[PDB]
Design a protein around this ligand. Structure first.
Ligand SMILES: C/C(=N\NC(=N)NO)c1ccc(NC(=O)c2cc3cccc([N+](=O)[O-])c3[nH]2)cc1
Ligand SMILES: C/C(=N\NC(=N)NO)c1ccc(NC(=O)c2cc3cccc([N+](=O)[O-])c3[nH]2)cc1
Lengths: 284, 284
């Protein structure tokens, strides 16, 4: 059965998704409104803490949380489902739809990085759509692998004289503080899949191992699928799939790329934000 | 003033050491025995947790702990003081004394590594002597930078398909799980200083930066100080000061080195253990 405290505030209904994890439709008794309830079989409390602090329109908000039994996380309903379903089976989005979605993922990830959070599991399964219409708001979800940046053990070590410090610690200094770049690589892979309908690194019809494809940065380019995709879109993809994390595009540099200097798309985004927002009277 | 709970069980006395940190002599009221009390100005509770679990004769034991005000950690008195004082000002130990001390540090560090703990701050300041005699027991102290090994974020990542995984994560696989090797490097530096009276990497009379000395592994060899030190001792030092952490000697390999196959030293250690041990009658 469901826990008593949950049943007290919500009525449970049908299944919406089935991860590995389950998501259910429920109604909040007090308001009679639809919510979604993520059930996780039993750092989930830390994921909750992270998600209570975050406030961005492209990031999922927690409405409630119960620790049974199992963990139950109540959130806003995203009737559009996962982005994954819009890209599976070589289905692909129109270029204008990718730009809208991608702009939102960048802003979301940018906001995470400004606030010392790395997501570490960005993929189409973790991007949710606000409605069944192609032009909609998306929200990033699933902070189970996320990581809070802060004062590292490395920084504390480098305040003393390194008389006793091992060489590998000193060499790691050259590349520390670039952990966030794994989110930018993931965005690059997501963008690729969105624009093309297929993944860049895959074991389908190759003898190069997946690992060797990824560490060399040699993505599977099929010229006849990309023919109808602009050059600007492909150019952004290439600056995100750069193997050196220090040379890879950050969220900032991706937001300044020619492909995202599209004032139609930005207006379409601003207007979607207003549609979502229903709140109080202002002075004036 | 001192906290009431501490004053309740102990009478405070003179200062023994003054770190950066203070260590005081105290008497336990119940037994009238001398103890040492480390005062740390306010993961110290985690250091306490680590040190309550550990049980090895060459590792410091906690007798009590109070969280004021400041933190107060009660421990066994080590009348011999820090190893640092026996090696400062180019003073050096006899080769037989280094072997005795070093054997103990290896066993201590070995035991830490078997139990998933990396110390990360081994230095002569953190090695304590049981008595003012040259032949004595030593104990490792100060677990403030220590680290509990466990199921890494890296291991969890490699259970899925790396479709979305960045190249730097896959490259880090080659060298992960060697964090403990920083303790073996530190032991190498400590041994060097003990056998020679001077540090291997230093800014004294050089133009090579400290960092460049350490990452190249080019220690300062002064032939006329080492002349009186055996070849076997120097050979062990060289296998610990190896820059590649994967090729560096572990505690196990150092314990099997010809320099530590000295049955006189091991007997002298076993007999010191018996001197320390005063406890209950046995069957038979
Ligand atoms: C926070 C979180 N997971 N955290 C975690 N540690 N997972 O392991 C989490 C993961 C997934 C979701 N998914 C949804 O809210 C979600 C999935 C889905 C599918 C069809 C339809 C809807 N829908 O609301 O219409 C859906 N909502 C919501 C939250
Ligand atoms: C656990 C710990 N420190 N932990 C920490 N986080 N430090 O920052 C710690 C550090 C140092 C010591 N030192 C001693 O017990 C200690 C130092 C010393 C000097 C002269 C003489 C004696 N003595 O007992 O005769 C001494 N004992 C004892 C504990």
């Amino acid at each position: 059965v469901y826990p008593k405290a949950l049943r007290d505030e919500y009525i449970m209904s049908k299944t919406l998704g089935s991860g590995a994890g389950e998501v259910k439709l429920a109604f909040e008794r007090k308001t009679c409104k639809k919510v979604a309830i993520k059930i996780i079989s039993k750092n989930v409390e830390t994921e909750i803490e992270i998600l209570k602090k975050l406030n961005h329109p492209c990031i999922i908000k927690i409405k409630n949380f119960f620790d049974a039994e199992d963990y139950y996380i109540v959130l806003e309903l995203m009737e559009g489902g996962e982005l994954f379903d819009k890209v599976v089976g070589n289905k692909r989005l129109k270029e204008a739809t990718c730009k809208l979605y991608f702009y939102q993922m960048l802003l979301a990830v940018q906001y995470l990085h400004e606030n010392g959070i790395i997501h570490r599991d960005l993929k189409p399964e973790n991007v949710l759509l606000s409605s069944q219409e192609e032009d909609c708001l998306i929200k990033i979800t699933d902070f189970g692998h996320s990581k809070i940046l802060g004062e590292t053990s490395l920084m504390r070590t480098l305040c003393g004289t390194p008389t006793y410090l091992a060489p590998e610690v000193l060499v790691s200094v050259g590349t520390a503080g670039y952990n966030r770049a794994v989110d930018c690589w993931s965005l690059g892979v997501i963008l690729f899949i969105c624009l093309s309908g297929y993944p860049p690194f895959s074991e389908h019809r190759t003898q190069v191992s997946l690992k060797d494809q990824i560490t060399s940065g040699k993505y599977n380019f099929i010229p006849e699928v990309w023919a109808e995709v602009s050059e600007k879109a492909l150019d952004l993809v290439k600056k995100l799939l750069v193997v050196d994390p220090k040379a890879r595009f950050t969220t900032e540099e991706a937001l300044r790329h020619p492909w995202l200097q599209d004032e139609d798309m930005k207006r379409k985004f601003q207007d979607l934000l207003s549609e979502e927002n229903e709140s109080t009277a202002l002075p004036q």
